[PDB]
Symmetry: C3
Subunit: 191 residues, 3 copies
């Protein structure tokens, strides 16, 4: 039965394309609000990717925690996060890769997750995160103008869901995205 043989080769092709510098890097930022709703920002791009946003009070519902998820093509050692005491004393970012846990399905890494809670005093949070594709040629700058174009070509998506259950059933599962829910259940699709 060759239907089986061809399918398994095709997954190996997909992995090698994703691990090539033509593979995308994807990042998701989940903001968990006091009313149980979830805001998600997703950005997808080539070479590197990042999100910078202010999560403010909503319809008031307040943000209580954050989960950042990267696709497995990121080099976790390049992950950097900025959070916004006085300006004369601030460091531009922290390298937070060590705080990311591996999300797995069927023994394969489907993503990397950093969850953290916001102190109860907060009514909003300003947050930026950035990561670089893990391909060994990432720090060998293909032409720089190619990376400049990648910045313009990055696509951003923002959605809000009434409850995590609805995020999981109408956003995570149908799109085959990696995720870790409130009960520590893993989601995603192994290649």
């Amino acid at each position: 039965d060759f239907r089986g043989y061809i399918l398994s080769v095709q997954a190996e092709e997909q992995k090698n394309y994703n691990n090539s510098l033509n593979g995308e890097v994807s990042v998701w930022v989940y903001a968990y609000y006091s009313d149980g709703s979830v805001l998600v920002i997703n950005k997808n791009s080539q070479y590197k990717v990042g999100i910078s946003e202010t999560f403010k009070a909503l319809k008031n519902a307040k943000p209580r925690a954050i989960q950042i998820i990267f696709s497995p093509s990121v080099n976790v050692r390049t992950i950097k996060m900025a959070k916004g005491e006085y300006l004369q004393r601030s460091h531009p970012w922290e390298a937070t890769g060590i705080k990311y846990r591996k999300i797995k399905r069927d023994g394969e890494i489907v993503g990397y997750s950093h969850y953290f809670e916001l102190p109860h005093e907060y009514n909003s949070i300003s947050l930026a995160v950035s990561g670089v594709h893990k391909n060994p040629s990432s720090y060998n700058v293909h032409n720089v103008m190619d990376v400049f174009q990648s910045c313009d070509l990055a696509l951003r998506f923002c959605n809000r869901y009434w409850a995590e259950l609805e995020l999981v059933n109408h956003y995570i599962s149908p799109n085959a995205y990696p995720y870790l829910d409130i009960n520590n259940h893993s989601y995603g699709v192994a290649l």
Copy 2:
């Protein structure tokens, strides 16, 4: 009559400045909605330029087609477009320069146009396009910090018009922009 002689030299000066790396690259994205209104995004910058936007249902009126226009300083071979099936299988962009038609006035190229219709099932579209100035030194990176500054200095403009007629009379013609309307009439001003 020297009034004539000086005017013709001045147009040649303008062309050479525009074809220099100090010339701008401009891009317009026209979104044609079901109610006959038109949304236009314009960005102008040095070295390279791009737009990334989601065109969603409006006051519901739905987007039906798109026309992207670049100024004649773009290198059409560098044009790249991203459109947003599953993430594990997506290519970061397509090189779409071959689909651009030359817009001309008095036998001179005033712009490049890519028109396409959206499938009727769509209620929205996420779209990004990018192009690099055609000057031969574009891929010889002047210092890279100059291009980084150009990203900050890019100016964006967004307007919506009730009908294409009003776009053409109050936006295209008074600004001397290149355009191709619904009846395939060309607009623009030759140097």
Copy 3:
């Protein structure tokens, strides 16, 4: 009394960190509206920083003047401003560093200020400004991917205040930001 000795060394450490390429560059754009309110955009980043915004009629109240302020880590000779006659004839920016005045407190530079009024005919203004950190290694591109990440990690803040008095008392003074108010009084905190 060693409490005094340690404090003075610590300020020298802060200056050297701020003048290093790990120090931030900060920019503020103040928009002064006809109703006496003030809109402020602040961006903070490593290596270089910029703002690009359109200041439109508000709750109508119209913008009448602009003050741009950079932190003392900027190289004023790299400051560039774009303002938006016809596209075929436009220069991508002007180098405006010579128009910046030094803001000082206790004989020390706390910032650089460019104030200008808008012509009364204007109902809005589109404006972009960019500056590069003054460290001598800024034009020696650390790896370029580091600067690409800095673009993603830049944090933006936008607030509007009812009157300059409230800006000064609830935004400038509590954050120790540099400023020059309507009566030419200087604000800021010297290292």
